[PDB]
């Protein structure tokens, strides 16, 4: 996906 996305994972 996009890594950790700064605290909101995969969607």
Partner 1 sequence: ATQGVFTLPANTRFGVTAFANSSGTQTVNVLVNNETAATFSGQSTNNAVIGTQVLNSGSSGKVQVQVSVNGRPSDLVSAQVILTNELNFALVGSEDGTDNDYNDAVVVINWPLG
Ligand X SMILES: *Cc1cccc(C*)c1
Provide the binding-site residues for ligand ZDC, judged by CB under 6 A.
1-3
User: With binding defined as CB under 8 A, does residue 7 bind partner 1?
Assistant: no
**Minimum gap (Å) between residue 9 Cβ and ligand ZDC:** 8
CA pair distance 10, 6, nearest whole angstrom: 11
Residues 1-11, interacting with ligand X (CB under 6 A): 1-2, 10-11
Question: H/E/C letters for each residue in 1-11?
Answer: CECECCCCCCC
CA pair distance 6, 11, nearest whole angstrom: 12
Q: Which residues bind ligand X (CB under 6 A)?
A: 1-2, 10-11
């Amino acid at each position: 996906x996009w890594x950790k996305x700064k605290x909101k994972x995969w969607x």
